[PDB]
Amino acid sequence: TQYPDARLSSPIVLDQCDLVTRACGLYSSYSLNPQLRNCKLPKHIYRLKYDVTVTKFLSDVPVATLPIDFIVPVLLKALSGNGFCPVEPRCQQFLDEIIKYTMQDALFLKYYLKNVGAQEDCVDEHFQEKILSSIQGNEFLHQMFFWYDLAILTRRGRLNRGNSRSTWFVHDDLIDILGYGDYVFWKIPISMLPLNTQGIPHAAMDWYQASVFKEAVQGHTHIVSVSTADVLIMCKDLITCRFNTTLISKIAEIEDPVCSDYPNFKIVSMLYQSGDYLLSILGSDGYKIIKFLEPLCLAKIQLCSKYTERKGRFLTQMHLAVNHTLEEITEMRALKPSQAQKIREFHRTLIRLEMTPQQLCELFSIQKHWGHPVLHSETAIQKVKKHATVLKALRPIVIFETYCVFKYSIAKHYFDSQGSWYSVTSDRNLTPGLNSYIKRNQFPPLPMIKELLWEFYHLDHPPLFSTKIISDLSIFIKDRATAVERTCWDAVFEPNVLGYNPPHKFSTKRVPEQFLEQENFSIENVLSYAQKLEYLLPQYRNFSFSLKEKELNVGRTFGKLPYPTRNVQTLCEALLADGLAKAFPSNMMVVTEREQKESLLHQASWATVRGSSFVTDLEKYNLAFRYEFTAPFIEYCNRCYGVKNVFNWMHYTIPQCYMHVSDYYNPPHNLTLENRDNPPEGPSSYRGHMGGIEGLQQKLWTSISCAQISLVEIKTGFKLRSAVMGDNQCITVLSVFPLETDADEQEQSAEDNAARVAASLAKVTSACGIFLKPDETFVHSGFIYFGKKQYLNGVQLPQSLKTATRMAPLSDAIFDDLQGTLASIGTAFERSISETRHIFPCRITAAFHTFFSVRILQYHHLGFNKGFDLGQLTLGKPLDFGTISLALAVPQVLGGLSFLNPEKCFYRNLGDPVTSGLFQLKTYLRMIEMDDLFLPLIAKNPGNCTAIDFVLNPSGLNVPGSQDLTSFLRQIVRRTITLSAKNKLINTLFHASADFEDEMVCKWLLSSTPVMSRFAADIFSRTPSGKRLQILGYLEGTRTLLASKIINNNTETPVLDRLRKITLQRWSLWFSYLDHCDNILAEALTQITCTVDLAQILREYSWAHILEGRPLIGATLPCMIEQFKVFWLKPYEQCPQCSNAKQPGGKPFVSVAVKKHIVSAWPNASRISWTIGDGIPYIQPAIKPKCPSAALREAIELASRLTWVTQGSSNSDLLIKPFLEARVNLSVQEILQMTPSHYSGNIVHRYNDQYSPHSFMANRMSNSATRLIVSTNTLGEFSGARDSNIIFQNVINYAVALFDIKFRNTEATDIQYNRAHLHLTKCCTREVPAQYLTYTSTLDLDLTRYRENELIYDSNPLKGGLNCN
Amino acid sequence: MAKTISSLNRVCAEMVAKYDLLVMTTGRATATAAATEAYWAEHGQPPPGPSLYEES
Amino acid sequence: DMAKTISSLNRVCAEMVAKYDLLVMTTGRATATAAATEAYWAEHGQPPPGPSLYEESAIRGKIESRDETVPQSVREAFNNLNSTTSLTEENFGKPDISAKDLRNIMYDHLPGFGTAFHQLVQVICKLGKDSNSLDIIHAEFQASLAEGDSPQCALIQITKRVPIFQDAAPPVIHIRSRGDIPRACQKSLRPVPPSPKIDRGWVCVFQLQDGKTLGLKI
Amino acid sequence: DMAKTISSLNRVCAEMVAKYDLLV
Amino acid sequence: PVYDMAKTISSLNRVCAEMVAKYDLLVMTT
C-alpha cells in the first residue's frame, strides 16, 4: 500500500543514505549525527550485502563515496540519452510525434486567433519551422527524456521496494546509475570532479582528509555517491524546468525578434552553467549564492527607473552581501586560482547583465532551477534556537503605544461597521477626552489621536465577536500532520536508528483519522479545552518541526502540535480571521500610479500625493516575538472574544515543549531509552523557546504589525498603507505635496519621507523586540514588488516562468489520472498567459507536455503492472497520433481531455463551459477539415448521475467522460465515515439516512418548474447536505487514499483494484469515441447553427432523467467569442457594420479606443504592454444582529435567496421553513425581519454579475487595460433598463485582452488601428426573460434532527445583541 | 486642598516622564509565570505533570 | 474651586495608571526587582529568570563603563536596541563601503582578469581610503554605470571627476622583475615621463628594483 | 462632581498598586 | 461631602506614594 510521488514534495534529507553506504560496504557522512555511524542497520537495507546486483555494481569502486550535493551539477551535464536504459518504450521515441502534436497545436492556436481577429499583422513565414528548430535544438531535450526514464524506473522501484523488482541498472556513456528501492547509487568518473589545491575533489574536502582520499581512490577511476530517490526526482524537476525555460525563451525570440520579455536563452544557459559550477565546488552551501538571484534581479529592476541615490543602494547592498557570502563560504575551501576566478561567474553575470525590467522579472522566477540544498536537522534547529532563545530589550513606552494603537484600530473598525461606538462599560472618568467623543457618538479624527492615545487603554466593553463563526468544518479535517502526544513523542523516529524500541506506540499522526476518532468534538468543546488550559497537560506538551521542502535557505521549519492543540490553533486562526483581524486589513493593495488623483488626495489628507514604500521581511518577526511584548495584545483578544486563555495558547505551550525535528532517520542526539522522558538538549533539539513559530498565530502577529505601522503613522504623520503577502510586508508611505513643486524634486522628497518612516518604524519595532535590519530593507519609490503582481511605476511586470516552468507530464493527480495531469498543465497555461505578454511560448510548452503526459501514462502507468500498454487494453489496436490528437481536442466538459482552451487567453472565468467548449471543438474541426465528425464527438451516451451530481456541478453535462475522480473519492470518504468514524458530531451529521436525505434535498431543489441548477447549488451550500459534501471533500492526495489506516480497512474490494477498473473505463471513454456515442442525441443535435442552442438542448438531454421535461434555465450563456465579432478601424474610417445598418441592422457594439497619454513607460513606449495610461482599470435588514454566528448568517443568506427567487409565489415562507429549522432557533418571521431581502430585479442576470462564485477576472496583464477606453453605451438597448445574456464584465475583459493580443509585439507607434468595434452577432445572443421559481411542493424531510449537532445548528442565535437600522 | 492636588499632579507627571525612559529585558520565565498564574486562577492547582520550563 | 486642578490631576493620573498597568501586564508575576537583578548579575553570569526593568541611563551606565555585572546577553540586547536610535532618514539604507569591498565591487564589473583597469581600481581604492572619499568614488561609479556607460568609462570618469585625483601623481609599485605584472597588463605600458598625473598622465608606475619603471595607460 | 472622578482614581491606582504588590 | 473629598484625596496620594516607592524598587536607579 504505497505510491511514490511523481514530483519532488519532501525536503532533501540524506541522513538515511548514510546507513545505505554502511550496508553496501561504502562510506559516507551525510548526517551530522554520530548515531548514524554505529546504529543497528534497518533490516530493510541490511539485505543489500546479500544482493548480487549491488555487489557487482560497486566491485570496481573504492570504499569512499562523495556527497551528492557536489555531484548533482555533474549529473546535470554528464547525463544524456545516448546509453541503454531498461525502459520500453523510451520516452525519446515519443519525441517525433510530440513535436508533431506541439506544432499542430500551435497551428490551431494561430488558426483560432485568425478567426477571432487577434492575429499579428507581421506574419513569420517560417513560424512552424522555427518552432521545430527550437524544440529540436533545445539543449535539455534529450536530457529531460532521460531524466523521465530514470524517474519512471525509480517510481516503479519505490512502489515495490520490498520485492525483487526494486533494483534497476542504467548505463549511460560514462555514468552508472544502479538503483535500489529508494536509494540511487551513481557511479561517476573521478576525472570530471573539480579539484582543490590539495589534489582531492572539492567533494572530498568535507568528509576525507587529503592523503586519505587519494589513498582510498588509488587505482579506481569511478566512484559512487549514494543518494535518495528524491534527488533523482529533483534533478528530473530541474531538467524539465530548464527545458521549459529555454524553450520559452527561444519561442519568444521567434514571436518577438526585437525584444522578447524573457531573458535570452543563452544568458539563462550561462547562468545555469555558472550556478552548477559554483555548486560543484561549494556544495549545498552554493545555494547561499544562488539564493541571491532574486534580490539581484529586484535590484536590477529597480535601477531601470530614474536613478535616485537610494535606488542603487539596493544593488550595492546585495552586491556587498554576495561578496561577503562568497568570501565566507570559500575562505576555508582551497580553491585553485582558476577556480576562484571562475566560481564568481554566476553573480558576475547577474550584476553585469543589462536587460529590460520585464526580462529581469522573468529571470527572477528561475531561482529554484539549480536545486534545493540538502537540509540537515541540525542546521535547521540552530537557526531557530538563536532567534527564539535570545534575550531582548523592550521599551515599555513603545509597547504601551503599540497596544493603545491596537485598541484604537479595533475601536475604529467597530465604529465603521456597526455605525456607532461599542457600549463602553468602563469608568467614564478614566477617559476624560474619549468620553466626550463617545457621547457625541463620533469617532475622533486621526490628527487628535496623538494626545488621546493613552486614553484608549482604559476603554472596556463586552465581548465584541462570537465564539462560533466557523463555517467550513473542513479546516478541522483538512489533511496534514500533527505531532504525536508527549508520552509517545519518539515514536516518529524509526526504531533501529533510534536504538531502542519506543515504549509507547502511537495510533496515528494523521489529522483526518484523529478528527474522526474524537468523540466529544465540538467548537465549544475546543474552547473548553483551551480555557481550561488543557494544552498545558503533560501529554500535550509536544512540538516538532518539519523541514520545509523546495527552499533555497538552509533548513526552514514549520511547526506541528498535538491534535488537540492543533484544533485550538485552527480555532484561533478562524476566530481572528472572521472577527478581529478584519480590524487590520493588510490585504489593501496600493499602486499609486493607477488610482484616481482625487481619491488619492482625500486618502492622504491625514495638491499632489506621492507614495513610496519599503518592504520588510515579516517572516523573521515570528521568532522575535516575546510574551513581554505580546501579553497585552493577547489578553485583549481574549477579552474581545469573551473567552479566557484561548488566544494565549502558544506562549503558554511552546515555551514549555522539547523542540526537535520529527525527522524519521535522525533523532535528537544522544537520545536513549534511559533519558527518553527527559531528553538531552543537543545540536538537534533545544528546550526553551521564548518566541513564535512560523505560521502559528499568523493572524495575531500581522495584527500587532499593523498596530506598529499605525503607531508610526500617528507619530510621524504620513499616510501609511500596510500590506502583507507571504513573508514580506510592504509599507507604502503616502506624502502630500503642494501642486507647484518639481516632479523630480517631489519624487526625491517622497522617497525621503519613506526612509524617514522606515527609520521611525525601525525604532518602534526595535523597541517591540523585532529588529528591522536596515541593510536588508529598502526604500522603493515606485517599485511595488510584494504580492502576486510586481509593478514598476505602475507598469505591470510579467512573471510568467514561475507557473510556466512547473508544467510536467507527471503531476500529483489522484492516482495517475491523465485528466488530472492534463488539467494541471491547463491551469499552468492559463496562469502563465495571464502574467505575461507572450502567447505562443507557454502554448508550446503546454502542448508539448500534454502530449507527453498522454504517452507516458499510456505505457508506464504506475498503477498498472510493468509493460501494460493502456492503449491496448482499451482500444485493442494501438493508440495512434490520430486518436490522441482528437481526444485532446474535445474539451473536458463535453467529455474528453482538452483542457487547453484558446479562449482562456482572452479571459479567465468562462461564461459557460459547455458553450465555450463547443465553440472550440467546432473551430478545431473546421481547421483539420473534419466538420462531419462534429456531432458524433459531442453526442455521447448520457451517464447515470444523480441529482446530487447535478447540484454539485451545475454547468456541466451528464457525460461520464466529463467527470473527475472527486465523486469516487467522496464515496470512499463516505464509506470510511460510516464505517469507522467515532466522532459524535459527524455520526449525527452522517446518520444512516444521509444518502437518502441528500437525494431528497437535491431532487427538491431541482423540483421547481423552472429548474435553476445554480440556485440549487447556492442553497445546497447552506443545507446540511452541503456541510456533508464539504466534510467529505478532504481527500486530494494519491498516497493518502492508497495508504491511509482508515481508508484501506474496508472489507470490500481493495481500493487499488477499483482504481484500476476506473482508470481503464476512463481510458475507454476518452480514447474510443465511436463506441460511446448516442445516435438519438446525434439526430436531435443535427442542423442547429448557434452554440447556445446546441448547448441548451444537449444540456437538457443529458440531465433529461432528472429534469423530466421541466425547462432548465440559468445554465447556458453564449460563448463570447462567437457572440461578438471584431472590426478594427484605421483612424478616420467607419466600420462596415456601422455603415451597412441604415438605422437598426448591425448597430449594437462595444467601442474600444486608445488613449494617447502615457503615464508611465518602462523601458520605453515601444510595446503596449510596457506603458500604462491614466484610464480606470475596469468598469436592507430591519434588525441586524451584532455578532451573527456562521449558522445564523447562513440562515439569513439562505432565507434571502429563497425569498428573492420565489418572489412570485405566495407560499415563500412555507418553502423556507424546513431549512431554517435545521439551522437556527428562529421563527421564519424573525429571520425574515433579519433578512436584507428588500431588493428585486431580473433573477438570472443579477445572479451572474454579483451572485455567481466567479469574479470574472481578465487573463491578460493590466498594463494594456489602462491604455484603453471601453464604452458599452453604444450597445443601444442592450446597454445598461435591459436584461440580456451579455456578460458585460467579460465583454470588457475580452475587448481589452483582444486589443492586447493583436498588438502584443508590434511597436506602439506602428499600430495602424486606433478604434475597435465589437459588434453583436445576431444569431448568438438573445434577451433572457425574467422569470421566477415556483415550487409546487415542500421538502417533507424533518431536518430537525440536527438540533443537537452544534456544527449545524445555532441554538441561541441572539446572544451577542442586536442593533437598529 | 489645592496644595495636595498640585503635589499629586507633580508626582504623577514625574512618573509619566520616567516611564518614557524605561527599558526592560525579556526573561526566561515570563511565559511560565503567566501559565502558573492562569492555571492557579482557573483550576486552583499548579499545572500538573513535569515541571514547566522555568519554575520559581 | 478645584475643578480645573482636579481635571488636570485626572488627566495625568489616568495616563500614569494606564501606562503602569500595561507595564504590569507585560512583565508577569516573575519580574525581577532592581536589587534582585543586580544580585543575579553578580552571583551568576546571566540575567535573572524574569523581566527586569532598567532606566535607559541606568544601564547606559555600567555598559559604557568597564564592569563585570552586566551579562553578555544584556549588553548585546541593549546595544541592539540602541543601535536603532542612530537611524535617521539619511542614515537608513546607506552601506558601509570599505576599501576592500570597493575593490571587489569594481572588479566584478571589469571584463577579463588582471587588465590595466584592475590596477587602476586598486590604486583608486588606495587614494580614496587615505582621503576618506570612498563614498564619493562609489557614488560616482554607480552614477556612471547607470548613465549608459561601460565600466571602463566609469573608471576613467571616476579618475577625472573625483577631486582627490585633481593632480596626484601615480603611486610607485616595487616589483622584483618585469614579469610580475599579469599578461593582460603587458599590452599598454611605456617608460615613465617626468611629473605624471593619474589620468591626464598615466594610471600607475611600477618601479623595478633594478631602476626600471614603466607606466600604464588606458 | 469631583467625587466620582477622584473615587474612580482610587478604584484604579489601588488595584494596580496591589498588582505591583504581588511582585514584591 | 467635602470631608469625603479630603479622605479620598488622602487615600489617592497614599497609593501614588506607595507606587512611587515600589517603582524605585523595581527599576534600577542609576
Ligand SMILES: [Zn+2]
Ligand atoms: Zn461599428
